[PDB]
Every structure is written in structure tokens, then in C-alpha cells.
Amino acid sequence: KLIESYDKELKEKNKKLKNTINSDLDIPVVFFKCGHIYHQHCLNEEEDTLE
């Protein structure tokens, strides 16, 4: 039962993640996961300051 659930769950999650990635202040960048977003090419990436 666990394997049967896990296979379907993994397939659905992979499909959803692929669709979300294909769906998408639009330059390629990783937004902060606590309420922030900025363009990496706008010098936001690698700001140093020991992160």
C-alpha cells in the first residue's frame, strides 16, 4: 500500500512541479522563501556580506 501510494504521489508531484516551472521582474532568479523577490541579474545575486 505504501509503495502504491508513493509511486502515484511522486508522479503527480513531478507533473505538478514541471507544469509550475513551465508556467513561469521576470528575469531568472530565486526568490526569497520568506516574503521577498528580486532579479538576480539586477545585482541582487551574490551580495557577499557573509550572506
Added chain:
Amino acid sequence: SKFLFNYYLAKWSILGDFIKEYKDDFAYDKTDITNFIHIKLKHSFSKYYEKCENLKSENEKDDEFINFTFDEISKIDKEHILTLLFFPNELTNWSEELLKIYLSFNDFRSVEKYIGKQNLVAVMKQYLDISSLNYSVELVTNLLQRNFELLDDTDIQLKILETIPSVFPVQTISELLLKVLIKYQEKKEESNLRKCLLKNQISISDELSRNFDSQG
């Protein structure tokens, strides 16, 4: 050329007695069937075979002559046993077939060589006919432990556990039972860990989707 070999090939009473004597022993890790045959031959004929073996040694590349010799040996079979003397390691000269003779009396090495996923419970049932007080149990335990990785099917494992002896001490099978239980628990734990990791990945994907929803 080959005419002399045919004459040499042209040129089974104590074999049964030797086979019975070998079958009398019931040791789990005794001498191999080929080893037992070699020991019996040393105790003992093979000189003519050795003369043929000298030609056979010179026939390391004569495939047609090898096939002809195998056919002659099949036609000159003695109790379907003496061919093993002519083919100590040439079983493919002329696998699902050696168990008729190799597994007939006793051969642990041949049993491992011809082991497989199927035809396993039958071998255990046949070996269970030793009827020894404890030597049979010891041999069964040794056979199970030697190829413990062969059994990997739930139905096969249940069938094997069903046909366990009902008059044996629990100490002998305690190690096997503990190993089986530990393997089952480890498999269940691994499946649970994989499911938890998949759930965590799904939660991460859901969090990304929620962040995207927050992003406009």
C-alpha cells in the same frame, strides 16, 4: 586420425556401490560430487580415458571432434554416470538436467550451481527426506544460510516458512527467524522513509505553489 579416437572411444557395476556409499554420508559441506568422483577414481579404467584425455587435451580446438566424442560418450553411457568422467567440466558439450544425477544422492556444490528463484521448495522437500534426528535439521539450516539471498519473494518466503519441520528445536531456526524479521523490519522502515521523503518533496512543491500564488 579420429579413427583411432573412435577406436579408443569404442575400447557400470561398482558405480552403483560407489554412489550408494557416497549417498550414505549426509554432510552439509562434504567433498563435491566431482571431488567424490575423483576420489573414487583415485581409489580405483580411467587410463584408457586418460589416453583419450591426451587426445582430448590435444583437441582443445577440435569442436567437431569434441561433439563426436560427446555423442559417442552418450552412446557409450554407463548408468548415465561415466559421462561425468569424460566431461568433468564439459556439461554443455552435449543445466536443467544435471539435477537428475548431481542432485540424486547428494551434491551441495551442484545445488548451489543449479540454484534459482524457482524449483527451490522442491529441493528443500527432497532434502528433508534424510530422516535424521538432528543432522537433517543442521543440513537444512546450512542450505538455507548458504543461499539466504536467493529467497526474495513474499509468496516464496511464506511457502518456505510453511514447510518448516515441526519437531525441531527453536534454537536452530532462531537465527534464521531473527534475520528474516530484521530484513522485513528494515524493508518496512525503508519504505516508510521513502514515503516520508516523497511527502516532504510534495510539501516543498506545495509551498512553492503557494509562494507563486503570493507572487501575484
Added chain:
Amino acid sequence: MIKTRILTHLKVSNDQLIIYRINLVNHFDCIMNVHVSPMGSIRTNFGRYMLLDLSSLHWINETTFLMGIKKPKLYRTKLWYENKKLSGGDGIAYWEGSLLLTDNILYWRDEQFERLKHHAIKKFDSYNGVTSNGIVFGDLKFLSSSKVLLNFELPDKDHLIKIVLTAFHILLLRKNTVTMVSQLNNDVVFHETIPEKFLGLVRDSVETFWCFSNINVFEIIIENEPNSVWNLLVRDNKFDKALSLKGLTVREIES
């Protein structure tokens, strides 16, 4: 993006220029050709050099040099070979325990081009270790891997060419049609207009580019070269050379 912002003989060895002098306004004693070794701090019109018809000059080391006559003895003295001749004056590349040449080419582990009575002067000139129909780029760091760029693909007498081979891009002169092209992407980065006879352009051995001219000397300077090639190198099979690149984004390097 990458920022760009721009006489008998001239040379530049190490933060020096070369009768006025530059230290980085003294006048030296008062010449046909010049040649400066790697050290920052040479035959006059008398046909000698106080302490030959060799149309070659290349500093093998901080003190060594190589030369050879068009009509091949190539002292380095340390002769290399001697065969055939040439009506004018070419490929004399030799570094990193290897040698190279430009109309025959011989492999030296340890092809035709345009020419004339007064042929090209500095067609083969690469630092850090050609033809009317195109140019050939090759680094020993070989013949099979050598590529070629058609001259017809270049933008725009008729822009007389005169070579600047930087690590990132390659620059030519083409009279007033000096342009920079990526050494690997086979794309022209940009072009420049040089206004007035031009004496020649040289690149700093120690990282810059200076152009000497009788009317007025000039220089060529570029910026952000490693940053632009970072993505191109990342989008390529080679990564070890890209990993050796410095002066880039810390996160990008981690990425």
C-alpha cells in the same frame, strides 16, 4: 555586459613605454626597428645593435629572442631549421615546450594564406601563450582541432589589416575597421574606428592595449570581460577552465 573604452617603433613590456620616455619627460639619446624583452626597463639604422635581414622577432623568454630571414635559419644562438624562402618576410609561434608556424605548416609537438611583395606584417601575433579569405585561430594548450573564420563573415587598401589575441576575444586592426570578436563563440563583440597613418597597436604583457601613431598615440581598454563569458563558459562542456575563472559572482561560482 562588458564595458569598452579606448613613429619608428614602439613597445610595452611592464608598465613602461618607449626620444622621450615614460616612467609610470626625460629625453633619451637619439633607428629602424625596435624590440623590447619582457623586462619593463633594438637595432638602429646602422644594421646592428651596439652593446641582419631577419623578418622575425619574438621574445622567447625574459632575455631570449627568435628571428629568421625570409630567404629560414632561425637562431634562438640556437638554430631551428632552414628550408625554402619567401618573397616578403610568418608564423614563428614557439612556447610551452612546443612550436607552431603559419605557405606550409609543420607539426612541432616539442595551409595557404594571402600575401604580396610587401605582405602582411603582424598577421600572427598571440599573447598569453590568416588570409584574405579568412583567419585561423589555434592554441597549443591541434591541427585537427583548429577552426577557421571566413573573412566574408567579418563586418564591412580596403581596411588594411594590422594581431591582438586576448584571452576572451580577438582583435584586429583593418585600418580604421578595428573590431573585437569572441575567440570561441565566433561572434563579433564590437568594432572601433581609428582615425592619419597608424604606426601600430600593442597589448601590455603584464593586461592592457596601447596603440602608437605618428599623429597621436592611443590605447584600448575593456572591462567586465570575465563576467560576460561566465554564462557562455557555464553553457559549455568545458568547466575546469570556467572553474579557474576569478573575479565573478560568489553565488554564481557556487551555482
